[PDB]
Amino acid sequence: MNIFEMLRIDEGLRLKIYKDTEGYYTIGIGHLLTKSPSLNAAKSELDKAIGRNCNGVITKDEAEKLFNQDVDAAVRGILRNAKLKPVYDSLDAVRRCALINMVFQMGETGVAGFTNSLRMLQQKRWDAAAANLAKSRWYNQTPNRAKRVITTFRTGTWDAYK
Ligand SMILES: [Cl-]
Numbered sequence: 044m045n046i047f048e049m050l051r052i053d054e055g056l057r058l059k060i061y062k063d064t065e066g067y068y069t070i071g072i073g074h075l076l077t078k079s080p081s082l083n084a085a086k087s088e089l090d091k092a093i094g095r096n097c098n099g100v101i102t103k104d105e106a107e108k109l110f111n112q113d114v115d116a117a118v119r120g121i122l123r124n125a126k127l128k129p130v131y132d133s134l135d136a137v138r139r140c141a142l143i144n145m146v147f148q149m150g151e152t153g154v155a156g157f158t159n160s161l162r163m164l165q166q167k168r169w170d171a172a173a174a175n176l177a178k179s180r181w182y183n184q185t186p187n188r189a190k191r192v193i194t195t196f197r198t199g200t201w202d203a204y205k
Pocket residue numbers: 177178179180
């Protein structure tokens with residue numbers, strides 16, 4: 044089990060524009076296109092993204108290419124972030140995947156807002172962090188996926204995903 048396999052489970056694969064759980068125009072493996080209502084604003088972003096006229100449909104390879112970019116982007120943003128970097132540096136390899144998961148999902152800024160939770164992770168207080176993470180809109184909106192992430196943090200194993 045690796046970060047890619049983990050995210051593929053949590054996000055799905057879709058070859059045609061769709062709306063995310065939040066109403067947003069998305070494609071491939073959890074690749075957000077825009078927060079605008081316009082289906083046209085989405086089709087434009089999408090061609091910009093691919094370098095072709097997609098007319099809202101992409102190939103597997105293309106979805107994978109975007110997936111590589113996003114995971115890379117997520118990892119670099121953590122390493123570049125003053126709040127995130129220390130947490131990540133302090134973590135084991137499994138728990139590190141958990142932090143990348145959250146960042147890919149909610150962006151650097153959002154995750155950086157979980158001040159208390161981050162502090163508890165850094166102090167290796169697994170149970171308490173898992174309890175704090177749960178008290179969020181994130182958890183309330185996408186509970187099954189959040190629970191899987193939370194369990195990964197609490198345990199340090201890939202149980203939730205196997
Ligand atoms: Cl709450």
